[PDB]
Amino acid sequence: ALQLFKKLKEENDEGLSAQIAFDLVSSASQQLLEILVTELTAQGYDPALLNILSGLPTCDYYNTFLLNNKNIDIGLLNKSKSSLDGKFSLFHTAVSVANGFMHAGTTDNSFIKANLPWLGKAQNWAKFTATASLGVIHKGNLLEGKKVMAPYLPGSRASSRFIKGGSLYGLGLIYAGFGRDTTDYLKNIIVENSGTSGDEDVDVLLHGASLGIGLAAMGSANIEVYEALKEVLYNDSATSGEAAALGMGLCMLGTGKPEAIHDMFTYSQETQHGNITRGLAVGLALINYGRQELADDLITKMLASDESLLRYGGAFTIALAYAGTGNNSAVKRLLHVAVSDSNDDVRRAAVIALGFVLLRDYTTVPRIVQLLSKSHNAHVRCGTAFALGIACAGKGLQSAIDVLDPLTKDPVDFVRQAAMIALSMILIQQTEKLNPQVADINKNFLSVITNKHQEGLAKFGACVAQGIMNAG
Amino acid sequence: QVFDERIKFANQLHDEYLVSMRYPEDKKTQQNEK
């Protein structure tokens, strides 16, 4: 990369060099960009080049864009509140997520103020979710990030521990990718409570810290963070262990350090809290991102261990390692494992996997997974829905839409939820003019929300999915 | 000895039967049809 610039230094002119920089930063992984600026600095390139590479330009432009060209249908806000009563915990949860998607990237206190009574009915972890939904909205505008969460960030709220935590978590949502400076602010609190976390007040705050720091330090592989999260994991807290487990594989993303994988792998055996153990299983997955064949030893071993826990994560380790490779081994393993595995959580998970592996090639996907949707296994069907979504999210392949329609109407409640979600994931912002079906799927949601002969489960998915469609 | 040959012969007729039957459906099913 660096050589491309020494050629262009002998031809140097602003337009030419800048077009290449814009091309480079969209595509490039964070690790590539990071090593690259140090090299240009010793080469003594213009600071104009490095500035682009900071990606402070690109973020200013996208803020303006969304500010102007965001159209907000207001009738959605008023309706979610009315139709799905917010006292019920599940229902607030769904409503909060749909909104955070709708109002992405640009600030809006338009929801808050109008729906002050809805807000009041939040309680427990429902309120934690709410506090964090804000930071989806206030994502971007990195500058006024700290500012706009400042009433809710600690030591200016004392009302409830749920707010305090969840204001820290959402802080990380804003700051992924720009988050190196932000990492300090979060680290201060983790080290203080690095021990004592058996205090129930302390725990809730700390959950939100631990997710935040994952998000901000994503992929940087600050070994300073990995250690601090580790002590938490050892204290064996009820719920913040979960966040730690994840938060470490978020940080160290893709390193695949032999130490790291091992240490976590040993800890899974000891632990009994059902959440942590799952979390570490998935956590092994995250760290073996795009590690191909260097991860094979781990992949054999998880699959070989009888634990429900370790087989669940077994499935997504293969998946993230071989993400976007048709590799025949990876495909054969996932099919054989899903069908013949007795346990339900593990069974759903190996089906989901397939979408990741087949991100690259979406052509052969409706047909492979025709077979699975046929299987009238309850769990299997749920995960076919989710799988289709991942694989064909970007495109509109017709075959995919069709496979998903019997699943929309399937009598098992839990299928219906995934299914409804999976359609809008596929058809994300695709004109209703082009394709009239989109409008019909949409109405179906609205109809189910009207229906009271449905479970809360369909209602939950159905609302979230409309927020997916109408996003930002 | 005698019966053994008969048993083996049946099996061959089965495989021919199984084989032929399924093939036209495949073509039909793919094609649009009411």
């Binding site: 915990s89 309680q123 427990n124 719920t239 009994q272 959440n275 009888d306 | -």
Partner: protein, 289 residues
């Protein structure tokens, strides 16, 4: 303000289930009881280690029948063996009634909340243990206070939502206005699993043991004869049965209790067996001598 308060999944050990079934089965139909000993970890993981039974009282389940002299003394025998762990609730068996908590059972449970407020009440139904089903359900009190201020959603937070809703009417009313029902999962080690799984010494020997030969004779004769009688039905059927209207075809030519299929199943089951039969005789002769 406090915890998530998602009702615990009651993780029932392999031993505690085996004893519970046995205990109820002996006592049926007279109500049976005992205390659950366990240990409380995580937010929602209660591992029910083991159970013991208290001597049958002529008052059935009663606070009166929770006899502290017995209870205490038991703790102490188990103490010396080091198998003692905190009481985490109580179970009893209603066979007479479905799974729910009677008014008498609600008072009993209220005393346990003082020990541990995450204590469970587990209803075992041993009359219906004669099916492949194990009919067992677990409950944890709800406070009236929670329902009056309509604060009940707190307890049902962040969960998959799968709730058993079997049993309604008075029972369900009581449940909704008094307890919370949540799932039971069974966790067992693979060590435990294997011991149980293992069968006889003669199990891995049986293939050179063989049926008495008078019965193989009998069976060969029965199959040849039976198929003949269903074959009559099948010949009659394909005389016609090439018209239209599906359901009518099945009544006209006796396409209900379909002969082709019932014949195909019997023919093959007998065919496979007869391969096994010969296989054993030849092998026995030759291996031994």
């Amino acid at each position: 303000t406090g915890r998530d308060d998602t009702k615990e999944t009651v993780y029932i050990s392999s031993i505690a289930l085996l004893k519970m079934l046995k205990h109820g089965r002996a006592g049926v139909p007279m109500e049976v009881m005992g205390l659950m000993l366990g240990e409380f970890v995580d937010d929602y993981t209660v591992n029910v280690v083991d159970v013991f039974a208290m001597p049958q009282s002529g008052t059935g389940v009663s606070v009166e029948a929770v006899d502290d002299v017995f209870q205490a003394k038991m703790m102490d025998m188990l103490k010396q063996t080091g198998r003692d762990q905190m009481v985490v609730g109580w179970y009893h068996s209603h066979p007479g009634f479905g799974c729910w908590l009677s008014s008498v059972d609600v008072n009993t449970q209220k005393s346990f909340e003082q020990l541990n407020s995450r204590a469970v009440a587990v209803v075992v139904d041993p009359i219906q243990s004669v099916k492949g089903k194990v009919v067992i359900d677990a409950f944890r009190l709800i406070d009236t206070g929670a329902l009056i201020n309509n604060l009940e959603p707190r307890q049902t937070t962040s969960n998959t939502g799968l709730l058993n809703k079997a049993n309604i009417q008075a029972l369900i009313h009581g449940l909704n206005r008094h307890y919370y029902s949540l799932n039971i999962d069974y966790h067992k080690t693979a060590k435990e699993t294997k011991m149980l799984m293992n069968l006889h010494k003669e199990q891995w020997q049986s293939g050179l043991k063989m049926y008495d030969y008078e019965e193989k004779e009998e069976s060969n004769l029965a199959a040849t004869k039976s198929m003949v009688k269903i074959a009559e039905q099948y010949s009659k059927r394909i005389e016609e049965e090439k018209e239209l209207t599906e359901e009518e075809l099945k009544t006209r030519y006796v396409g209900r209790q379909d002969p082709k299929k019932h014949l195909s199943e019997t023919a093959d089951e007998t065919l496979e067996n007869n391969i096994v039969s010969v296989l054993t005789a030849g092998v026995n002769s030759v291996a031994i001598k």
